[PDB]
Design an enzyme around this catalytic site. Structure first.
Site, PDB file in Angstrom:
ATOM      1  N   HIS A   1      93.465  52.943 142.849  1.00  0.00           N
ATOM      2  CA  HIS A   1      93.809  53.192 141.454  1.00  0.00           C
ATOM      3  C   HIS A   1      92.594  53.579 140.621  1.00  0.00           C
ATOM      4  CE1 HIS A   1      92.495  48.960 141.258  1.00  0.00           C
ATOM      5  NE2 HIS A   1      92.201  49.220 139.998  1.00  0.00           N
TER       6      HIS A   1
ATOM      7  N   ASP B   1      97.928  51.357 147.701  1.00  0.00           N
ATOM      8  CA  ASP B   1      96.729  51.425 146.863  1.00  0.00           C
ATOM      9  C   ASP B   1      95.506  51.025 147.690  1.00  0.00           C
ATOM     10  OD1 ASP B   1      94.700  51.046 144.850  1.00  0.00           O
ATOM     11  OD2 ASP B   1      96.302  50.914 143.360  1.00  0.00           O
TER      12      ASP B   1
ATOM     13  N   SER C   1      88.660  44.808 140.775  1.00  0.00           N
ATOM     14  CA  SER C   1      89.236  45.802 141.667  1.00  0.00           C
ATOM     15  C   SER C   1      88.687  45.631 143.079  1.00  0.00           C
ATOM     16  CB  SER C   1      88.947  47.213 141.157  1.00  0.00           C
ATOM     17  OG  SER C   1      89.498  47.412 139.867  1.00  0.00           O
ATOM     18  N   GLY C   2      89.520  45.958 144.063  1.00  0.00           N
ATOM     19  CA  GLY C   2      89.148  45.759 145.449  1.00  0.00           C
ATOM     20  C   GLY C   2      89.155  44.295 145.833  1.00  0.00           C
TER      21      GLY C   2
END
Ligand SMILES: *[C@@H]1O[C@H](CO)[C@@H](O[C@@H]2O[C@H](CO)[C@@H](O)[C@H](O)[C@H]2NC(C)=O)[C@H](O)[C@H]1NC(C)=O
Ligand SMILES: *[C@@H]1O[C@H](CO)[C@@H](O[C@@H]2O[C@H](CO)[C@@H](O)[C@H](O)[C@H]2NC(C)=O)[C@H](O)[C@H]1NC(C)=O
Ligand code: NAG
Ligand code: NAG
Lengths: 237, 286, 243
Positions: free
Chosen positions: A41, A90, A186-187
């Site tokens: 994303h 994702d 994120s991640g």
């Protein structure tokens, strides 16, 4: 990370933070010293031109350089069947132009083999650079917390998500709250303890706030995407 | 008197814990506390000496570290009534009524909850206006109590989605810590503070629906056309006080005339021959 | 100060005069007044020489009845109102008859006998309840300001002479009856060898037996509670209290 503690400089060498425009935005994990596993994303169309990306490793406090002493990303490969509405598939891969030789505090994590036979209420750990309580700034130091894996059938209840979890996505955390990741994580490496070796089985994709009741975190299940990663490695060389 | 009690009451079973029935027939105590309540037919096994049943957890706890007895007796069904009243205070504050059950039926508690004074099963209607999915009813809660805790947050594309606490029900909720209603266990000589109230059917003034009260059941108590009632006797102290027995040494014996008998009449000793003679000079104090 | 507890501290005066009253018509044993029957014995036609506790021929009385309306007095709970129970006392009291809506009500004061009037000791109280004498001897909690109010023509106060959240240990408790339309009542109280006796009579010269209780101690003091009411004044029906 809410309710966790500061991560001591132990042995957790599977967290690589990606910096663009001299500011941290998204992180990632490494499995082999030729690729970087992270979410997709943050690799949208406005985030093109992978030449303007750097990676840092073995850095707990995010102040050790300025526009230098990093690894430039050569090319980024994303999942072709990615949807921006439901946030499905994702997972993105970033390739570094540097060999990244193994040294102290540098050790990747092996991919989970098919047929792990994971326990329902399995213990897991989370790590990343995010807010403290709610809508905060990026944490200067590295913190970690402990989470548990909840069942998809219980996660698809009408009171928690109302059947908004795809089979390629799994839920984890605590339904009571106080343990969740905020915006900016994120991640993130979601590893577990089994056979005296850690297995990267999760990947933070999206969420609905942090430290909120009936709103657990959403982690990408890399079990289905195992064959997709091997296809990109063989096609590279 | 032990003989007068067991005679006028249809006693079915009598057992004592940490106490022998030999010393009961003649002793002296300080006080006696009696507890009486009906016996459910299905829950008849929960009244034993130590059991984690529905009765000993939410209705009445039986102490073990004190000398006590258990009385099991029956009562005729003629000219008898059963009083079913809710001892809870905060439950009747929001308009609680009665169970409205048939005769010869008793109500027992199995899931009990305890809340604080600052509690109101009612949400602020000014906040629920921005809700589209799972919108709970709201009304004006009286002053001194906070409204229902509800939060508005988006998951992926739903702007108006409000989440509250105590879901789905306080009996089996996913986050018991977030819900103010917490399970409690009754102690020695303590009643249940209250039962679980479904906040989805609550709320003019905040008036919860009568069907929203969950955590209770009922069962008949008819056995051989008679009702079973339990009685518990606890003795406080021994060999002291003034509550002594009567059938220890004086059981109202009969007058034996003709032979000489020892005298212990009103504090006088001696022997003599009895002889019934019609007299009328005695008064009510002589 | 009678007890050791705080009953009330609302409009309590400091001192007063409170002079006792001595009356005429001393006792005359020539007809039976001053004597009492035996405990539970019946004596037929004969002459008995009994050695007991009897008053002296030609002795005066003391009026210990107290009546209040709004304010109490500190000297009311001090000697010589708190006499000593040396061997015993003989009381001659009358029933104050009140007429309300053509109904007869008779109430009089309350006598309290004890040793130190504390929780760890026993205390005997005899109070009338519309013709019912409740003679109980328990370990009550006496306060520093004991008093009693009237049922008929109730005052603006409340009867509060003892406060206890639980029933204390009692050795005697029994009710008695008497003639409500009587004129005078007599009582006998004395102790000997650690036991206590009591007598009462509503009509007639002698006195009848009530009970005999064993205590094992020696009582020393006794006091008569005041009767706070509103119909014992001059503006109301003309009637006074005598003890
Ligand atoms: C009551 O007792 C007196 C005293 O003893 C009795 O008087 C005497 O009784 C005897 C027996 O009959 C006579 O012989 C005497 O002459 C009586 N003396 C006097 C002075 O009367 C009296 O009779 C008794 N009353 C009874 C038994 O009803
Ligand atoms: C003696 O009589 C008094 C007065 O009737 C009794 O006191 C009553 O006791 C009952 C039961 O506790 C109460 O409900 C009443 O209010 C009491 N009345 C008064 C005026 O106090 C007393 O119980 C009687 N004693 C005995 C041993 O029966
Ligand atoms: C013995 O005397 C008593 C009393 O006088 C009497 O009741 C009893 O019948 C007598 N015994 C016999 C065998 O006559
Ligand atoms: C009570 O006294 C009245 C008046 O002297 C009298 O008529 C009545 O018989 C007496 N009652 C009793 C029970 O003595």
């Amino acid at each position: 990370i809410v309710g966790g503690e500061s991560a001591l400089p132990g042995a957790w060498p599977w967290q690589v933070s990606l910096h663009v425009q001299n500011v941290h935005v998204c992180g990632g994990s490494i499995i082999t010293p030729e690729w970087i596993v992270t979410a997709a994303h943050c690799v949208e169309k406005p985030l093109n031109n992978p030449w303007h990306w750097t990676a840092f490793a073995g850095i707990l406090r995010q102040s050790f350089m300025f526009y230098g002493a990093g690894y430039q990303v050569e090319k980024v490969i994303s999942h072709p069947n990615y949807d921006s509405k439901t946030k499905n598939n994702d997972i993105a891969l970033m390739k570094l132009q540097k060999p990244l030789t193994f040294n102290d505090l540098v050790k990747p994590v092996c991919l989970p083999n098919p047929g792990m036979m994971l326990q329902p209420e399995q213990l897991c750990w989370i790590s990343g650079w995010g807010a403290t309580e709610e809508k905060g700034k990026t944490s200067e130091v590295l913190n970690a917390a402990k989470v548990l894996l909840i069942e998809t059938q219980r996660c698809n209840s009408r009171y928690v998500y109302d059947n908004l979890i795809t089979p390629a996505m799994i839920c984890a955390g605590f339904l009571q709250g106080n343990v969740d990741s905020c915006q900016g994580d994120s991640g993130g490496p979601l590893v577990t303890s089994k056979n005296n070796i850690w297995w990267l089985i999760g990947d933070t994709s999206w969420g609905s706030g942090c430290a909120k009741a009936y709103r657990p975190g959403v982690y990408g299940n890399v079990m289905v995407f195992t064959d997709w990663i091997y296809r990109q490695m063989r096609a590279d060389g | 008197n032990l003989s007068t009690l067991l005679r006028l009451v249809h006693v079915d079973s009598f057992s004592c814990n940490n106490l022998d029935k030999s010393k009961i027939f003649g002793s002296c105590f300080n006080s006696i506390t009696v507890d009486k309540f009906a016996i459910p037919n299905r829950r008849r096994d929960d009244l034993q000496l130590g059991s984690s049943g529905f009765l000993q957890s939410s209705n009445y706890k039986i102490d073990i570290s004190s000398s006590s007895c258990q009385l099991y007796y029956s009562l005729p069904l003629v000219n008898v009534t059963i009083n079913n009243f809710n001892p809870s205070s905060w439950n009747r504050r929001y308009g609680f009524g009665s169970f409205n059950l048939s005769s010869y039926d008793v109500v027992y508690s199995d899931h009990c909850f305890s809340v604080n004074s600052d509690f109101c099963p009612c949400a602020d209607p000014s906040v629920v206006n921005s809700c589209a999915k799972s919108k709970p009813p709201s009304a004006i809660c009286p002053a001194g109590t906070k409204y229902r805790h509800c939060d508005l947050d988006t998951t992926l594309y739903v702007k108006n989605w409000c989440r509250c606490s105590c879901l789905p029900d306080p009996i089996s909720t996913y986050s018991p810590n977030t819900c103010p209603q917490k399970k409690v266990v009754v102690g020695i000589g303590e009643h249940c503070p209250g039962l679980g109230i479904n906040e989805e059917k609550c709320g003019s003034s905040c008036f919860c629906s009568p069907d929203a009260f969950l955590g209770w059941s009922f069962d008949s108590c008819i056995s051989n056309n008679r009702c079973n009632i339990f009685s518990n006797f606890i003795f406080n102290g021994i060999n002291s006080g003034t509550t002594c027995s009567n059938d220890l040494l004086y059981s109202n014996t009969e007058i034996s005339t003709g032979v000489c008998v020892n005298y212990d009449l009103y504090g006088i000793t001696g022997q003599g021959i009895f002889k019934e003679v019609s007299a009328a000079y005695y008064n009510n104090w002589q | 100060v009678i007890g050791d507890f705080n009953c009330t501290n609302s409009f309590i005066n400091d001192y007063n005069k409170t002079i006792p009253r001595i009356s005429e018509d001393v006792v005359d044993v020539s007809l039976g007044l001053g004597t009492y029957y035996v405990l539970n014995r019946v004596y037929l036609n004969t002459t008995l020489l009994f050695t007991g506790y009897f008053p002296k021929s030609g002795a005066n009385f003391r009026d210990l009845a107290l009546k209040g309306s709004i304010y109490l007095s500190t000297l009311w709970y001090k000697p010589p109102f708190l006499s000593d129970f040396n061997n015993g006392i003989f009381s001659k009291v009358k029933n104050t008859k009140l007429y309300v809506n053509n109904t007869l009500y008779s109430e009089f004061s309350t006598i309290v006998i004890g040793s130190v009037f504390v929780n760890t000791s026993y205390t005997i109280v005899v109070q009338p309840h519309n013709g019912i004498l409740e003679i109980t001897a328990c370990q009550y909690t006496m306060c520093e300001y004991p008093h009693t109010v009237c049922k008929s023509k109730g005052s603006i106060r409340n009867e509060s002479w003892h406060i206890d959240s639980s029933e204390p240990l009692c050795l005697f408790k029994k009710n008695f009856t008497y003639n409500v339309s009587a004129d005078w009542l007599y009582f006998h109280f004395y102790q000997e060898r650690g036991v206590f006796y009591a007598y009462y009579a509503d009509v007639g010269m002698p006195t009848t037996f009530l009970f005999s209780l064993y205590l094992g101690t020696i009582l020393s003091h006794y006091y008569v509670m005041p009767l706070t009411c509103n119909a014992i004044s001059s503006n109301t029906d003309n009637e006074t209290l005598e003890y």
